[PDB]
């Protein structure tokens, strides 16, 4: 009685229950060899200056620069006012403002009616 492990976006599939880890062919083994080749080609370039004794400063990391550039400067040129963006923008953008506007107008309209009729308690209210 071993129920399957159902995964969610917040609970990744264990590497020991993933079928891809137990049906391995020659092509996958070759692929894993060149994943380690890049992981080893990039490592040395970091090491050839990490260990350099005449180096004082910051080792520029292009991967870091691209990450920050993608988050800030490369968003608008890749923006297309398609159907998804227009609905999401109107919903997230204009939605809350219109929602809160009527939450406060109704609350203030209700409160104004009482204060003009005397049935609102303001006995000790002299700080506003």
């Amino acid at each position: 009685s071993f129920p399957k492990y159902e995964a969610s976006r917040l609970s990744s599939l264990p590497t020991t229950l993933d079928p891809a880890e137990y049906d391995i062919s020659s092509e996958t083994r070759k692929a894993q060899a060149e994943r380690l080749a890049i992981r080893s080609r990039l490592k040395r370039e970091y090491q050839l200056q990490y260990y350099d004794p005449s180096r004082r400063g910051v080792i520029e990391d292009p991967a870091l620069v691209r990450w920050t550039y993608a988050r800030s400067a490369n968003i608008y040129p890749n923006f297309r006012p398609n159907t998804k963006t227009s609905l999401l923008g109107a919903l997230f953008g204009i939605g809350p403002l219109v929602f809160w506007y009527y939450v406060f107008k109704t609350d203030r309209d209700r409160k104004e009616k009482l204060i003009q009729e005397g049935k609102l308690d303001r006995t000790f209210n002299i700080s506003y």
């Binding site: 004082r56 910051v58 920050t68 800030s72 939450v103 406060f104 203030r108 409160k111 209210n125 506003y128």
Partner: protein, 459 residues
Amino acid sequence: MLKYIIPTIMLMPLTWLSKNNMIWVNSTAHSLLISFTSLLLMNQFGDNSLNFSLLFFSDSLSTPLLILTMWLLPLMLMASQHHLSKENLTRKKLFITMLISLQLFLIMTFTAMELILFYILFEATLVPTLIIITRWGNQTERLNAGLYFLFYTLAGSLPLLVALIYIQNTVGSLNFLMLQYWVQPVHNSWSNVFMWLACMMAFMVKMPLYGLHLWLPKAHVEAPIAGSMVLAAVLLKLGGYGMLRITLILNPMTDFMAYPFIMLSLWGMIMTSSICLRQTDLKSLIAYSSVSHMALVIVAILIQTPWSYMGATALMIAHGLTSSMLFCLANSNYERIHSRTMILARGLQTLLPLMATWWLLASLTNLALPPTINLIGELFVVMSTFSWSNITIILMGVNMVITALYSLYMLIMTQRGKYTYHINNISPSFTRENALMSLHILPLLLLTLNPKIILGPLY
């Protein structure tokens, strides 16, 4: 006010007539004397404001803003002494002249009795500011940040000029004292809806209002350190100061015209405060923190209650010393690693023990730790808005939680954790840097002992 205008002008001869290696010493020393003499403006009375002449006056709203403005100038000179060292001598002097020219316009802006003399100087603090951003930045984006900083402000200011001249044609004058006794109610008509929208739009761009704020993450980020300090500490308060005055002649239309801006500010608080949670740039994270803090200022000003006005004045002063400190702190790291990315240098508390203390104090003031004046002002605006509508306590509360998250996240991300291995050029903190932070934080905490001098004319 001539006792402050002339000495400010005399710094320019001092810089241009000093020995080549004493430009910073002489300018810094005498700019500190002008700050010392600025305390003479605290002769305020409880009924009548200090009226020097037909042109200049000084009430309790502009007195702390004059004291703050004159006190940052020595701090801007200290902050600029590193990245300008390998610069031409004639260009170093011109840089200092722009800062001095900026101060000269600011101390006349906060003291102008006429609203058109105010406008001319209020709009004159764009040439010295724009030139600093564009000529003494570091990235290619300074030029595009100058254009955004320029055409956002002018697009709002020009209608204000038409509106002020229209008011002069009808009321008879734009002297602020006269307007108090000649003010008339603003009847509800489509014409007055657009007079209202021209008397408040120029100021809300500079606050800035959510939506009209895309120039702040650009200008405050791309500008030099001195530009960042003045931009985020004295130049965002021009809109706040003008609004506190221009709302005098916009009653009772402000009762219903304020909703779309109270709603943008209240909801703009959460959005801007949430962006900080996910910023890759340390300097940009601090820039958005000003949009979230100044949102309360707009809400407080608009709802027009004696408690809100007291809070807005305290918030503006408190935000001035805190944002400047954070930019200076973020600039200390930048001058070592030459990168604004917040995840590049970590664990700096292990290498800079004292500088990590300054980070804590700035962060604690930013998240409104009581009894700092960052909390007195923020507390007052919350009390005022609760009486305005009890539901606003929810939006204010959420902002406090998000504010604590991004303030400590900035501290933890850069100071704690394991230091970056390949960063081996973290020089011990200079006396200039330590003294620069001590000049921000010590005045901020001392004000907690005598807070009455920053609560404005409603005290």
